[PDB]
C-alpha cells in the first residue's frame, strides 16, 4: 500500500480511508452502477 498522503494524523488516516473507498468503488465501477 502506498500512503500517497498527532492531532492531524487521524485526519490523514481518514483521508487515506476515504481514498481507498473511492478507489474500490471505481475498481468495482460502482459509480456507473
Amino acid at each position: 500500500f502506498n500512503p500517497r498522503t498527532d492531532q492531524a494524523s487521524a485526519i490523514k488516516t481518514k483521508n487515506v480511508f476515504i481514498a481507498q473507498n473511492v478507489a474500490s468503488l471505481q475498481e468495482l465501477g460502482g459509480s456507473e452502477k
Binding site: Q26, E27, L28, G29, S31, E32
Partner: protein, 51 residues
Amino acid sequence: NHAIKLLTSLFQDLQVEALHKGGPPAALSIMAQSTSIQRIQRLIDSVPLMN
C-alpha cells in the same frame, strides 16, 4: 519537474478513462482530440518514456 507533473496529470486522466481497466498517436495540435491512451502513445513514440 514540469514534465514529470504533466506526465502525472495525463496518466491520471488515462486511469479515469480505463475505469475497471476500461488508434494512431495523438497529433501535435490543441484541437487534436484523441483517446487518453493515444496521447500517452504519442509521448512514448516521441521519447523512450520509462528510460
